Amino acid sequence: SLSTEATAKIVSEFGRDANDTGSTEVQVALLTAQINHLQGHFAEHKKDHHSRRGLLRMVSQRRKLLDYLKRKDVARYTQLIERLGLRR
Amino acid sequence: VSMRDMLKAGVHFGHQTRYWNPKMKPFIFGARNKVHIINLEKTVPMFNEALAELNKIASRKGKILFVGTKRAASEAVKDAALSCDQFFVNHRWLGGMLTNWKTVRQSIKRLKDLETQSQDGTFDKLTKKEALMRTRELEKLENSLGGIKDMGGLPDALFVIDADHEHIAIKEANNLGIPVFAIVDTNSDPDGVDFVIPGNDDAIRAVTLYLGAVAATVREGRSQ
Amino acid sequence: SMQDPIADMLTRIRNGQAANKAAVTMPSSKLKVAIANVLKEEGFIEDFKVEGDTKPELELTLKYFQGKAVVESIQRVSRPGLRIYKRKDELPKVMAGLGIAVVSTSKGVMTDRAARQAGLGGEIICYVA
Amino acid sequence: ELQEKLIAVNRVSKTVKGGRIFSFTALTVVGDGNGRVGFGYGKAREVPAAIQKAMEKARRNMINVALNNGTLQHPVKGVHTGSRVFMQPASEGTGIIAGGAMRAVLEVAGVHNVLAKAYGSTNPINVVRATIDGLENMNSPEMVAAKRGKSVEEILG
Amino acid sequence: MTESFAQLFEESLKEIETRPGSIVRGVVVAIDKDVVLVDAGLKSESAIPAEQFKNAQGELEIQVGDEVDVALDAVEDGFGETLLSREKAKRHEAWITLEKAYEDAETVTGVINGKVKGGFTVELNGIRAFLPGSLVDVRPVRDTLHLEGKELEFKVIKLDQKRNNVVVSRRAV
RNA sequence: CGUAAAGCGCACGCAGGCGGUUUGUUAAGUCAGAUGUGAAAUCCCCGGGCUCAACCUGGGAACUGCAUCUGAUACUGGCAA
RNA sequence: UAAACGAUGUCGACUUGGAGGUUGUGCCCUUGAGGCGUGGCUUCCGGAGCUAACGCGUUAAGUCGACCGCCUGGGGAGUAC
Ligand SMILES: [Mg+2]
Ligand SMILES: [Mg+2]
Ligand SMILES: [Mg+2]
Ligand SMILES: [Mg+2]
Ligand SMILES: [Mg+2]
Ligand SMILES: [Mg+2]
Ligand SMILES: [Mg+2]
Ligand SMILES: [Mg+2]
Ligand SMILES: [Mg+2]
Ligand SMILES: [Mg+2]
Ligand SMILES: [Mg+2]
Ligand SMILES: [Mg+2]
Ligand SMILES: [Mg+2]
Ligand SMILES: [Mg+2]
Ligand SMILES: [Mg+2]
Ligand SMILES: [Mg+2]
Ligand SMILES: [Mg+2]
Ligand SMILES: [Mg+2]
Ligand SMILES: [Mg+2]
Ligand SMILES: [Mg+2]
Ligand SMILES: [Zn+2]
């Protein structure tokens, strides 16, 4: 999946504190990072459908979290999507 | 009866955990060494209440049928039932003793005919071998129906040893509304029993304890 | 997922009665408390209590009469999919009055008889007979 | 004194080496006309013997129903196999409105005014059982007051 | 005075340990021709076959009311019967006798049941023994027939409890 | 809707349907009341006239609706926490 | 497209047991062996209950709730356009 050190860096970058690993922002950030990493694996192994299913699962979950975040607090949503270069 | 009295006899033992009826959960104290231990705190007061109700039944000319066909306790049940001017079944319970009372009446009529004949005579009008054959038939019938030969009608209450062992009789009683008092071990089903006495049903000492209490209360009700 | 907690309560009552349980326990709610209150006041259950503060557990002590459940049939009427509302003159009666219909009116939860006598209609929560 | 009514007679057959053995079955219902009804079902080689076995069986296995001046206490549903029966109390003058199988049972039971209808399978043998069960579970205001720990008017009034 | 059922039954547990193999002394209530009713007091009057209570002469050396020490097997085999057997008591007593005789270096008579490659098998009070083939006799006894079925005295050299075998030979003399 | 006809081969997922628990507020849904209207005839109730009936006819109920206004706030919805 | 079959749509809740398997994990005996629990998945019996029966039976086909997919005599026919 993701190594402990990269996840820790993402947690510190997007979280209010280290203990916060459940905020919508950090969850979306982790999902985005793992999605970006998997792109190479699926770029070479186009026929790895079983893992492609998990990639689709994480994409969809990020979509649902982003919808909740947008409807609940627009300003943090705009900040996050700008910072992560998303929705485009 | 005393809590100490039952504990001394060993009423509290039951069957193994693997062989049990879940409906008997309220009466089970717990388990030790993979064997169930019955709650005698349930046993003693229920036994007293059964004694009281049996006292009323016996005091109103009630007919009491002592039933237990375990090979261990059959002799004790026979003697205890005869000690109190009541009726018993000490060999294999015949399916339909109560619901097929008409056919059991036919058998009782046969018994009375045979002994009346064997004492009036007519065996001198029969070959000595025919005499012996009819005597053998009379003996077998006497063994089969000796305890109920003079019951006359439907019994007013059933007392049962090992409800599971005598479930057929409990089924007929349930169908005919006859109240059942039954010694129900941890492995048996207490739903069909109007008055369930939760305790050991194997040990001859405990069987004799229950029966002695029952017979004493019956004689109390009888004396008036 | 869980989408009708009143149905969950009714079904807990029904299944506990079928299984001869002495008491049943469920996550609490003010509506559940009021329905349990009306059931108790109409005598279909012995008593009820609530325990806890942050995750309240409501407990109902059921009642049996002749080795029989006092509550014979308990069914939700206004399920979430199809809400059922009635006017004061259209309020149903269960078993020709032997049972009770629980009604939520503008003045709180009460029986059909009470709602009629107070001249109100409302949502038919459930039937009990 | 009890009144007995034969609901249906049917001929069955069993096949054996030599051929078909014919027998008969009889469904009858006895009642006291005052809330007590039993049903019986007998088998025999000939019809009168089958009917007599059915009568004897019907006299036992009988139950009591808490009628209310010749009509039911409240609407009732009954279910046995595929026979779903519905009965409801009716005002005086209605009489017995029901299919034949339910008609006989209700008449011998004493329900003077009832509206009934059978849904699903109208097989008489199961319709009678479902009607009997429905009438049996039907309770009375005094019994429901006893259960709920209150009085009659406390439910009625 | 509600003297706790827990305390009362706990004292009985002090006096009764429901464990197979535990030796408990029980009282015979009735003696039948084929069975012996021993009421050790667990679940029922255990019906131990009378054949076990017969000695080598076939006589019952027990009477009504006699106490006998019996080993525990179980509580109930589906019919509520406590299974007890005098034979296991025999086994226990034989093992104790052998264990003490090894300390005593005493000689016990036994009957050679058979022969194996490594030696012979003997019977001592119903317990199997191994007699080394090289140590049967000092002289090279070619006649192996005469040493079969006769009672010969042996001393326990190595008493084995894990394999239930006793190593014996014609020692002492 | 296991075998009688009837569970998509399987998964994701947009529109749609439903939604844990507490407090406030809203009066949308909901309920109550009132007003207007719901043509007349027909159906129903109590009567009246053709010698009875069909038929004609008086008064009423009904026409379960729609709209407006003033209230109730438990439940569903909106909003806020 | 398949008898793509468990001929049993997805999800949530409640309801007596037993014998196994497989995979975690806690405590305790002196621990290894061994005794007490506590989860996941899974097979076979079986009560209530349900079913037309067969059977299903806490992995329901029981008791309910949310949404969806179908069914309406057989043949013609999964055929014609
Ligand atoms: Mg992840
Ligand atoms: Mg029959
Ligand atoms: Mg049909
Ligand atoms: Mg089909
Ligand atoms: Mg499928
Ligand atoms: Mg919504
Ligand atoms: Mg809510
Ligand atoms: Mg409004
Ligand atoms: Mg008009
Ligand atoms: Mg006129
Ligand atoms: Mg007019
Ligand atoms: Mg609100
Ligand atoms: Mg094809
Ligand atoms: Mg297909
Ligand atoms: Mg396949
Ligand atoms: Mg397969
Ligand atoms: Mg298919
Ligand atoms: Mg899905
Ligand atoms: Mg099964
Ligand atoms: Mg085609
Ligand atoms: Zn037993």
GROMACS .gro file of C-alpha atoms in nm, chain D residues 58-112:
model
   55
  499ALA     CA    1  -6.547  -3.508   1.639
  500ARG     CA    2  -6.707  -3.535   1.982
  501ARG     CA    3  -6.359  -3.516   2.137
  502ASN     CA    4  -6.092  -3.272   2.014
  503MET     CA    5  -6.347  -2.992   2.061
  504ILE     CA    6  -6.285  -2.637   2.181
  505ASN     CA    7  -6.478  -2.348   2.334
  506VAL     CA    8  -6.536  -2.014   2.161
  507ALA     CA    9  -6.636  -1.699   2.352
  508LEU     CA   10  -6.929  -1.591   2.138
  509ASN     CA   11  -7.114  -1.261   2.185
  510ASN     CA   12  -7.492  -1.295   2.138
  511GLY     CA   13  -7.448  -1.513   1.831
  512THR     CA   14  -7.176  -1.303   1.666
  513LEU     CA   15  -6.799  -1.271   1.691
  514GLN     CA   16  -6.610  -1.038   1.923
  515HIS     CA   17  -6.387  -0.881   1.658
  516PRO     CA   18  -6.266  -0.945   1.301
  517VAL     CA   19  -6.038  -1.247   1.276
  518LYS     CA   20  -5.801  -1.397   1.020
  519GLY     CA   21  -5.718  -1.766   1.009
  520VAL     CA   22  -5.448  -1.949   0.819
  521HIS     CA   23  -5.381  -2.317   0.757
  522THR     CA   24  -5.186  -2.449   0.459
  523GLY     CA   25  -5.321  -2.252   0.164
  524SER     CA   26  -5.663  -2.174   0.315
  525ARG     CA   27  -5.679  -1.814   0.440
  526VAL     CA   28  -6.017  -1.736   0.598
  527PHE     CA   29  -6.151  -1.398   0.710
  528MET     CA   30  -6.445  -1.353   0.947
  529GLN     CA   31  -6.601  -1.043   1.098
  530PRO     CA   32  -6.883  -0.971   1.343
  531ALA     CA   33  -7.210  -0.865   1.184
  532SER     CA   34  -7.530  -0.694   1.292
  533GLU     CA   35  -7.847  -0.887   1.365
  534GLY     CA   36  -8.042  -1.006   1.062
  535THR     CA   37  -7.737  -1.079   0.848
  536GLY     CA   38  -7.748  -1.452   0.915
  537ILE     CA   39  -7.466  -1.683   0.815
  538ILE     CA   40  -7.273  -1.548   0.516
  539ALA     CA   41  -6.996  -1.794   0.429
  540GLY     CA   42  -6.888  -2.069   0.196
  541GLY     CA   43  -7.026  -2.414   0.261
  542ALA     CA   44  -6.732  -2.547   0.461
  543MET     CA   45  -6.729  -2.240   0.685
  544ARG     CA   46  -7.110  -2.225   0.682
  545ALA     CA   47  -7.150  -2.567   0.843
  546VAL     CA   48  -6.884  -2.503   1.108
  547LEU     CA   49  -7.028  -2.165   1.205
  548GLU     CA   50  -7.387  -2.291   1.206
  549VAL     CA   51  -7.308  -2.583   1.435
  550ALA     CA   52  -7.095  -2.348   1.647
  551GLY     CA   53  -7.383  -2.104   1.696
  552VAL     CA   54  -7.253  -1.785   1.531
  553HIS     CA   55  -7.587  -1.642   1.418
   0.00000   0.00000   0.00000
